[PDB]
Amino acid sequence: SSDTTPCCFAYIARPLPRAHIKEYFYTSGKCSNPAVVFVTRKNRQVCANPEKKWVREYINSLEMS
Amino acid sequence: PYSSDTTPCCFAYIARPLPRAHIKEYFYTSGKCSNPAVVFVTRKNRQVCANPEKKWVREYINSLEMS
Ligand SMILES: O=C(O)C1=C[C@H](O)[C@@H](OS(=O)(=O)O)[C@H](O[C@H]2[C@H](O)[C@@H](NS(=O)(=O)O)[C@@H](O)O[C@@H]2COS(=O)(=O)O)O1
């Protein structure tokens, strides 16, 4: 029920704890900066750099379900 | 330096004025966003993007600041 789009303007500096992430999604291409959003169990939407190794690894684990 | 949590931005503006009585709050999207924008929060808690340059948008804001 919202017309807004979540975008990222900064990336979290250190790897987020894997245990508390329930899913992820890529921010819209409309956004100026590319980004991966890790959603935590407390519904925090954390921005991360798609080029980081840990980020790609977390995505892989979330993709294997 | 800035929050690493997602921030809402607008990429489209509602074409015509929303019913004034259905609006309870408003807020400008971050200056970090590509487009300047006003987001009106309706009483059903929906969020609508609007153009700050529009006359009705500025008037709605002036009204909201009174209530
Ligand atoms: O209380 C807020 O509404 C608010 C809190 C956060 O500090 C930040 O949210 S955000 O990281 O998702 O954007 C935001 O603070 C500022 C925001 O940084 C400003 N944009 S900027 O000048 O480009 O940096 C602008 O949008 O105003 C926000 C709130 O102003 S404040 O209430 O005085 O802090 O919003």
UniProtKB/Swiss-Prot annotation, chain B:
Consequence of substituting residue 31 to A/K: No effect on inhibition of activity by tick evasin-4
Transmembrane segments: none
Cystines in this chain: 9-33, 10-49
Modified residues (Methionine sulfoxide): 66
Residue(s) at site: Cleavage: 1-2
Glycosylation sites: 3-4
Protein's UniProt name: C-C motif chemokine 5
Organism: Homo sapiens (Human)
